[PDB]
């Protein structure tokens, strides 16, 4: 109950202050695509793939609790390796360059 | 593309073919099918124009909304059986979502309008994996969850696709479309028989493999599309539409060429099971798929068409195309009927 | 058996409170004061505990 | 499988987290852990076509503890009484 | 009694950030030789004030979608205000079991106020330079979280109270002091300060203006109170809970305070510059230390317990 | 009452669905998912699906629907239409409302309903688990097994994020 | 071995950011192997006691096996006290 | 002089001292004068709720000793 | 320095997880008397 | 079966019919495609949870991890299209009528 009360009144009182700066006494009477660069899209795209990576090694922490540490060790080196290749190939393909 | 990224791309979509046949998880099957498919897209996608585009997207479109009702008959049957076993499902409704999961990826009839389509839209190499390989991983899962099947509705996809595919090559005259609805009618038979004996399909799927193969690698010899582009053959390589015509005979199921024989053992197979009606209906309406084979053997091989007078600045040229496999293909094509017992090694 | 456990913990409860009471109540109090009830915070007072234990019983 | 690599290798690829009763970190149990295990040796080795007929009752213990479909419309059954007997004042619940 | 507590939290961050505004004008000010705000109110204390007061009378200055427009704020702000509610200083508000992947979570979410204002602006360039700005927020937001995963390997959960224990002997700085240092920058440009701060930059080649301020130095604050506890580590007396707190904010002001200091001391970057920085120099050795992390405590025998 | 706060949480995640499914602007449409994955994270946490429930957050929300939002701002749309405009889609969103309400309705008067199937209605607290008293989690000592029992699923796995990251390039080059 | 040296020298003077990296990674991969330490880490994880340690029904054939906690069979931690 | 920098740095200090305070003594009065219990697997919230019902007035910070054996 | 106070947290949560042990029987006794008892009280109202 | 799975399966649903009946940007329809994901999602992790099969907890995280890759996949045939046309409009993937 107590983390969905900080929830709500963290939002409730963004939603008041907004509320109130934009309601104040004033005293007066009186979908194309946009300039789309491919470039921007990748850099998205990237981030996706690399972010699920990381998803899988967020577990890393309680993994090395096992007793089969050879077999964790090993897999958690292999894809920590894979992303270093993946960033190695979008590298050497020109995808990380912002000219042309 | 670069020849090593090619050669990785197309060993993914044989790993993930090999992810889902030896996979006893359903969660590995699934995954399998998401590598292949991701691993596909490239080259349909590789010779970069709009109508690569259109099928690629199109080919997305429905392969991922396949997968999206596999993965929900696995996980309604992980809450009626809190297995994950490959095998028969304990959920008919379960059952139905990846029978219709499974016919969506195989292209059968309702679920056929991709089919002609993105094989229009793909080169010549990536068509004859698009309607052979892919082929392998979603029957193979048919092969082991039969038993919990629906027969009528398997039946009835069945049927329809042999009277789509046959009705719908007749009126083509672009060649990739000629394969796609053929290869409709075929997957038909493939699944007809399957409640029935499982083995056959696989007799079916290897058999059609092989002269769906040939046919492809014929084509891309000659860089022949169409049918009147084809008909220029006989005036450059006059083996090649002897080869053409008897490939195209034996998928028309004319004895004694090796494309009887599928359609042989599965009408014995079926009428072992009192099913007389639907084998002869079957074998009747194959009888489309002939003709408009016999079109393609007639603009050919057995008839001249008209040529061009720059045809002859080809005629001092050889084929430099691989062909690879092309003539153990083509004779596997024809003359293997009688070797028909051997179909017992898939037993 | 569930029945001889809690006789059991009952008379060991007994014994501590015949003999060393006290400074098993500064121990507890110790432990208790701790969100997570740490031991390595009570060390002394684990200590006075563990040595009337063993001098008594 | 479709070809049994597994098998013939003796590699485990993925069995190990198709079935619940199968080995867990720290032998924490699934709830059915005895139902799925009574209903798998049952069913171990006779196939599907015998086991669909003589282990229905292992099978069927083991979807009740899946999914508790009789055990919930029991409890509404008698929550559905209880409400109707305090509606008329018949019936006044213990502390 | 929550309900206070929530309160002793919200105003006295918002308090907070209205007076860093003056601290980092005065800071400013004598790194570059003069004064800074010294006459509104004694030594410039109310010149927070005067502004907040100014801003919120001023005329409200069409927007492409209405609800977008005010989403974007709220979000912004309500989000800032959720980052403090695990913070342990020792105790926190809601003690969380995962506190640091909730951090990460939340903290993901804050670039749709980056999105939406861009699609509410009803202009094309303001569009453009919203999705730029989202390039650069995600784009280092890759770091962050494999640093963070590389420290927790040696503190072993994901809970932030931990990271109080892991450092009983010892700051975490001083096992990870390069993990540290590319922490500290990602938080820069994460947080769009200088010198990674190119949407002021390229920009320039009332009240709503001032919640999305009040919002980004909520951010700042609070990253620098996560460096402290992360690497910089305070001892937590049971009997004495404001020793901690009076340490661990002089921590988090000195860091802070450094981040005044780095805006008056170098020129900017420029946005490809600054996408190299991440992608061809920070995410290389993120990933080498991040394998390094990893093996270390088992080759050593220093994993950490699970609890 | 709290009790049934799980079924709350599945209303609201429906009525988000119907918010996208009947697809207005795709600006709006992202709006939908956004608050239907908030949702229906909220629902995995009652469950004891902690960091399953973070994950959404993570990585649904603050991964794939950003670059979603990303790419729609960019190669779809700039400027939302008004939300229910469109006729379809309002009528389309008020069909999928009534059936929503129509069906909570029956569910809460009868405590159960056949919407097709049959459905227990007298909430999701009753089939709980009753005892548990361990010093760990068993969502995160499952998770934390994909890398002892795993290998096979963190090898085809890991493959297939590079060959994503490889087939995507060779996808956009053109 | 001399190329192999003036390799390596153009790289640090050239790129000591990459050289870091791939120096930093290949110590990650080998040096588990070489360390007389890593043993313990298997010993350490194993020791800990997560579930009940359910008792033996004593057939009078287990004279490994210990009676009472504090009896001297059945594994002991002096190795991980001195640790 | 720079010296002049400190009294918005003091405010500054004092409205970040305020959170952390206020938590703690917060904790402490809601608490019997303890440290909030910790639970965050379900062997501590276990051993919370049977101090509770032990506690004879439904709360789990009110301990009961020998006193009560 | 990291490897020595991280043994010694090992040590700390063994000591930990051992408390546990011990209790742990007297605990499950009466977890055991206390879902009988509510199970058999649900049976009292049941029948009536 | 239980109250929530009436939803969950009716999110899916929904979803599924979304799909299917499509308008005319063709990013809405992959909305539709990653709400079938979510509702999955959430429908999984149910069951998995409520029934305690601690392994099978990873499934989940798989399931999310391959749609997403599968979502950005989509993406860049979407911008393909839109680059060839100038918008993701459905009605102009027609080419391949003939
Ligand atoms: C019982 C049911 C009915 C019968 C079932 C029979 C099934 C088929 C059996 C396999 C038949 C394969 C073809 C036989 C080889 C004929 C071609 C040949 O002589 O190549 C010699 C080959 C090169 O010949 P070539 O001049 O390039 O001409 C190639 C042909 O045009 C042909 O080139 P290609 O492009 O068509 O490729 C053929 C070959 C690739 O080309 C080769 O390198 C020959 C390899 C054939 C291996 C046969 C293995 C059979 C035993 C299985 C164990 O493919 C393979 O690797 C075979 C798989 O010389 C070798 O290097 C020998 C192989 C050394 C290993
Ligand atoms: C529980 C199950 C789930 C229930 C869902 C609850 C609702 C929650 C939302 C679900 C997603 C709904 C998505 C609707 C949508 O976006 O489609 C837009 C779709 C096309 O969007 P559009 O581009 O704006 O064009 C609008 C018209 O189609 C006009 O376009 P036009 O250019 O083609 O104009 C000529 C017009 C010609 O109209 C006609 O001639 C039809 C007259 C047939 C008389 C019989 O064309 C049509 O009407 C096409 C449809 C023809 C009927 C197809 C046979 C069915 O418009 C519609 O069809 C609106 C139908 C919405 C009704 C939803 C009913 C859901 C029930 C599903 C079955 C479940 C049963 C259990
Ligand atoms: C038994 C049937 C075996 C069939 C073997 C057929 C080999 C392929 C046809 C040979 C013709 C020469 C050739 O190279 O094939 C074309 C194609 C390569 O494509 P291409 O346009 O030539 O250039 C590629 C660079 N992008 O080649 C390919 O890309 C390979 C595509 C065919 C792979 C699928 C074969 C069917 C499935 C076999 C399993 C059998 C059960
Ligand atoms: C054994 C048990 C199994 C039994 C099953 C039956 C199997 C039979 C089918 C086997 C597979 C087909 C192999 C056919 C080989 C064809 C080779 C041939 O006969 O010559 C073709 C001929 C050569 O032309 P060219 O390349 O230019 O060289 C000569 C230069 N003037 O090219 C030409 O001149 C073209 C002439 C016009 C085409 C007329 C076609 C009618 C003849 C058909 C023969 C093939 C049979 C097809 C039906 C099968
Ligand atoms: C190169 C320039 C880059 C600029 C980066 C910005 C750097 C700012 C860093 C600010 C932090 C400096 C430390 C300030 C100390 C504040 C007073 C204090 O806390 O003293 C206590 C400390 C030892 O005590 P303690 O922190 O509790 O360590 C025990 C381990 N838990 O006493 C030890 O000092
Ligand atoms: C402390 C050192 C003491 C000295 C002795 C140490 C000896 C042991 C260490 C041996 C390691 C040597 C490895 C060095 C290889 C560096 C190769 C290289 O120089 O690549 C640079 C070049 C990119 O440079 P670019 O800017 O694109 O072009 C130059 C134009 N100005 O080419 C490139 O494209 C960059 C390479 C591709 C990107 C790979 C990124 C690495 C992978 C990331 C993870 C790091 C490794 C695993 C973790
Ligand atoms: C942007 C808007 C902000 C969205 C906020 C997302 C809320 C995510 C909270 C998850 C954090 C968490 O895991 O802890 C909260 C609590 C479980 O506490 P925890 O310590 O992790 O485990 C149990 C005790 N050991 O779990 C709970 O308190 C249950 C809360 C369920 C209701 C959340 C519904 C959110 C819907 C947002 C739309
Ligand atoms: C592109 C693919 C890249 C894949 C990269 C994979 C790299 C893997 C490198 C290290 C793998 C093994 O790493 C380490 O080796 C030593 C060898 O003594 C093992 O052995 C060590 O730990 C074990 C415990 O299991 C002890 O029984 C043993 O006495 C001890 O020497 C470690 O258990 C293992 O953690
Ligand atoms: C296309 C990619 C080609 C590369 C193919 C690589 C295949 C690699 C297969 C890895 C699995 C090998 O085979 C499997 O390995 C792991 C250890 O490593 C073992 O697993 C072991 O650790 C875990 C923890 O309990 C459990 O699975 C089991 O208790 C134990 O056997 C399996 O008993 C063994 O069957
Ligand atoms: C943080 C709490 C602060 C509490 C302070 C409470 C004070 C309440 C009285 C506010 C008086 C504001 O005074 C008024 O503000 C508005 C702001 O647009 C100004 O502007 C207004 O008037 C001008 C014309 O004069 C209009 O063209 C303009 O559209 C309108 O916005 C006025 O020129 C100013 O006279
Ligand atoms: C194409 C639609 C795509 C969206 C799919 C939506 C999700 C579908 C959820 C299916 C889950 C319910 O599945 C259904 O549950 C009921 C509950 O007992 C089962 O049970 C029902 O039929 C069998 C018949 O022997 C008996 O149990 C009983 O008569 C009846 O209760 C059904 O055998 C099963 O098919
Ligand atoms: N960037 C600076 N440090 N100076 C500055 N002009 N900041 C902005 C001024 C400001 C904005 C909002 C509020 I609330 C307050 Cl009180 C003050």
Redesign the pocket.
């Known amino acids: 109950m107590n983390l969905m009360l900080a929830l709500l009144t963290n939002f409730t009182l963004a939603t008041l202050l907004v509320i109130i700066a934009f309601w104040l006494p004033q005293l007066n009477v009186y979908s194309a695509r946009l300039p789309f660069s491919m470039k921007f899209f990748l850099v998205a795209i990237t981030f996706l793939l690399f972010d699920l990576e990381i998803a899988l090694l967020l577990p890393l922490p309680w993994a090395s609790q096992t007793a089969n540490l050879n077999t964790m060790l090993t897999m958690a080196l292999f894809l920590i390796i894979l992303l270093a290749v993946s960033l190695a190939y979008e590298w050497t393909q020109k995808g990380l360059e912002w000219t042309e | 593309?670069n020849?090593i990224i090619?050669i990785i791309i197309?060993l993914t979509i044989m790993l993930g073919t090999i992810i889902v046949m030896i996979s006893s998880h359903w969660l590995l099957v699934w995954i399998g099918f998401e590598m292949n498919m991701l691993a596909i897209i490239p080259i349909m996608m590789?010779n970069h124009n709009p109508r690569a585009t259109e099928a690629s997207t199109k080919y997305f479109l429905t392969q991922s909304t396949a997968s999206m009702l596999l993965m929900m008959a696995v996980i309604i049957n992980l809450m009626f059986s809190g297995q994950w076993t490959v095998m028969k499902l304990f959920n008919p409704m379960a059952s139905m979502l990846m029978t219709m999961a499974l016919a969506m990826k195989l292209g059968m009839a309702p679920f056929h309008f991709w089919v002609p389509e993105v094989t229009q839209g793909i080169?010549?190499?990536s068509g004859?994996?698009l309607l052979?390989?892919q082929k392998?991983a979603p029957m193979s899962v048919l092969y082991q969850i039969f038993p919990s099947i629906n027969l009528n509705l398997i039946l009835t996809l069945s049927v329809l696709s042999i009277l789509i595919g046959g009705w719908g090559g007749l009126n083509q005259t672009q060649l990739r479309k000629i394969m796609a609805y053929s290869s409709i009618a075929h997957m038909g038979w493939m699944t007809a028989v399957l409640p029935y004996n499982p083995t056959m399909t696989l007799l079916n799927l290897?058999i059609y493999?092989?002269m769906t193969?040939t046919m492809?690698?014929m084509f891309?010899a000659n860089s022949t599309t169409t049918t009147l582009s084809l008909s220029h053959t006989w005036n450059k390589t006059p083996i090649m539409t002897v080869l053409i015509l008897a490939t195209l005979l034996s998928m028309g199921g004319l004895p004694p060429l090796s494309g009887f024989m599928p359609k042989w053992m599965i009408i014995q197979e079926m009428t072992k099971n009192n099913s007389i009606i639907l084998p002869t209906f079957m074998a009747i309406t194959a009888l489309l798929n002939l003709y408009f084979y016999m079109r393609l053997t007639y603009s050919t091989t057995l008839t001249m068409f008209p040529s061009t007078n720059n045809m002859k600045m080809k005629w001092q040229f050889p084929l430099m195309?691989?062909?690879?496999?092309?003539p153990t293909?083509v004779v596997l094509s024809t003359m293997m009927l009688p070797l028909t017992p051997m179909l017992s090694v898939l037993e | 058996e569930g029945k001889l456990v809690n006789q059991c913990a009952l008379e060991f409860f007994r014994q501590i409170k015949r003999h060393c009471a006290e400074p098993f109540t500064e121990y507890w109090t110790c432990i208790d004061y701790s969100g997570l009830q740490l031991f390595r915070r009570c060390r002394k007072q684990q200590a006075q505990f563990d040595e009337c234990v063993l001098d008594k019983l | 499988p479709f070809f049994d690599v597994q098998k013939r290798l003796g590699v485990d690829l993925d069995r190990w987290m198709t079935i619940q009763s199968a080995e867990q970190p720290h032998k924490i149990p699934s709830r059915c852990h005895a139902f799925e295990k009574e209903w798998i040796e049952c069913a171990h080795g006779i196939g599907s076509i015998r086991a669909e007929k003589e282990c229905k009752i292992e099978f069927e213990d083991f979807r009740e503890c899946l999914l508790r479909q009789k055990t919930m419309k029991r409890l509404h059954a008698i929550r559905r009484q209880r409400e109707k007997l305090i509606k008329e004042g018949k019936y006044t619940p213990p502390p | 009694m929550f309900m206070i507590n929530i309160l002793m939290l919200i105003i006295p961050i918002l308090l907070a950030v209205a007076f860093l505004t003056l601290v980092e004008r005065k800071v400013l000010g004598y790194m570059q030789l003069r004064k800074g705000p010294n006459v509104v109110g004694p030594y410039g204390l109310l010149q927070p004030i005067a502004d907040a007061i100014k801003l919120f009378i001023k005329e409200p200055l069409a927007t492409s979608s209405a609800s977008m427009f005010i989403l974007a704020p709220i979000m912004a702000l309500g989000l800032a205000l959720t980052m403090w509610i695990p913070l342990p200083m020792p105790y926190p508000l809601i003690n969380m079991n995962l506190g640091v992947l909730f951090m990460l979570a939340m903290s993901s979410l804050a670039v749709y106020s980056i999105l939406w204002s861009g699609w509410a602006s009803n202009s094309k360039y303001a569009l453009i330079g919203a999705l730029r700005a989202v390039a650069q927020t995600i784009s280092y937001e890759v770091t962050l979280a494999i640093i963070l995963l590389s420290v927790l390997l040696m503190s072993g959960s994901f809970t932030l109270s931990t990271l109080i224990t892991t450092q009983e002997q010892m700051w975490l700085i001083l096992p990870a002091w390069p993990l540290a240092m590319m922490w500290f920058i990602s938080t820069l440009a994460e947080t769009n300060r200088a010198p990674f701060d190119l949407t002021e930059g390229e920009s320039e080649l009332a009240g709503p203006f001032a919640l999305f301020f009040m919002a980004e130095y909520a951010n700042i604050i609070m990253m620098n109170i996560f460096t402290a506890i992360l690497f910089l580590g305070t001892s937590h007396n049971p009997h004495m809970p404001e020793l901690y707190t009076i340490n661990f904010t002089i921590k988090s002001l000195l860091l802070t305070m450094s981040f005044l200091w780095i805006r008056a001391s170098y020129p900017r970057f420029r946005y490809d510059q600054l996408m190299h920085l991440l992608w061809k120099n920070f995410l290389p050795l993120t990933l080498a230390l991040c394998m390094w992390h990893v093996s270390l405590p088992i080759l050593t025998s220093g994993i950490p317990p699970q609890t | 009452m709290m009790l049934y706060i799980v079924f709350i949480l599945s209303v609201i995640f429906v009525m988000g669905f119907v918010g996208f499914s009947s697809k207005p602007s795709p600006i709006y449409g992202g709006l939908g998912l956004i608050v239907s994955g908030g949702v229906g994270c909220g629902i995995v946490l009652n469950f004891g699906g902690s960091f399953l429930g973070l994950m959404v957050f993570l990585i649904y929300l603050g991964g794939m629907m950003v670059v979603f939002g990303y790419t729609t701002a960019m190669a779809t749309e700039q400027y939302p239409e008004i939300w229910l405009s469109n006729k379809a889609v309002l009528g389309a969103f008020v069909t999928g409302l009534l059936m929503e309400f129509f069906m909570v309705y029956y569910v809460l008067k009868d405590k159960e309903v056949e919407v097709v199937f049959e459905f227990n209605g007298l909430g999701d607290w009753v089939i709980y688990d009753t005892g548990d008293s361990g010093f760990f989690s068993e969502e995160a000592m499952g998770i934390a097994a994909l890398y002892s029992y795993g290998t096979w699923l963190v090898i085809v796995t890991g493959w297939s994020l590079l060959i994503g990251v490889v087939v995507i390039m060779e996808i956009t080059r053109g | 071995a001399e190329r192999v040296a003036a390799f390596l020298k153009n790289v640090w003077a050239k790129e000591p950011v990459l050289v870091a990296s791939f120096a930093i990674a290949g110590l990650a991969v080998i040096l588990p192997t070489l360390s007389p330490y890593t043993k313990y880490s298997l010993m350490i994880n194993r020791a800990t006691p997560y579930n009940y340690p359910v008792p033996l029904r004593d057939d009078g054939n287990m004279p490994d096996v210990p009676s009472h906690p504090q009896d001297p069979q059945g594994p002991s931690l002096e190795w991980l006290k001195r640790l | 002089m720079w010296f002049e920098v400190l009294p918005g740095i003091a405010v500054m200090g004092v409205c970040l001292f305020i959170p952390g305070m206020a938590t703690a003594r917060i904790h402490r009065f809601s608490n019997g004068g303890k440290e909030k219990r910790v639970a965050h697997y379900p062997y501590q919230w276990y051993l919370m709720e049977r101090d509770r019902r032990v506690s004879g007035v439904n709360r789990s910070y009110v301990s009961k000793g020998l006193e009560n054996i | 320095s990291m490897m020595k106070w991280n043994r010694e947290r090992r040590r700390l949560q063994i000591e930990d997880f051992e408390a546990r042990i011990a209790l742990m029987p007297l605990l499950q006794a009466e977890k055991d008397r206390r879902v009988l008892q509510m199970l058999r009280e649900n049976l009292e109202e049941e029948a009536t | 079966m239980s109250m929530v799975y009436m939803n969950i399966m009716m999110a899916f649903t929904v979803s599924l019919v979304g799909l299917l009946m499509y308008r005319s940007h063709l990013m809405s329809s992959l909305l539709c495609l990653e709400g079938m994901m979510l509702s999955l999602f959430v429908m999984a992790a149910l069951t998995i949870l409520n029934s305690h099969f601690t392994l099978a907890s990873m499934m989940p995280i798989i399931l999310l991890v391959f749609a997403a890759c599968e979502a950005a996949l989509g993406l860049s045939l979407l911008v393909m299209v839109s680059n060839t046309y100038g918008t993701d409009y459905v009605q102009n993937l027609n080419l391949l009528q003939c």
């Open positions: 593309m020849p090619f197309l590789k080169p010549l190499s004859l994996i052979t390989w392998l290897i493999i092989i193969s492809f690698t891309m195309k691989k062909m690879t496999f092309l293909m």
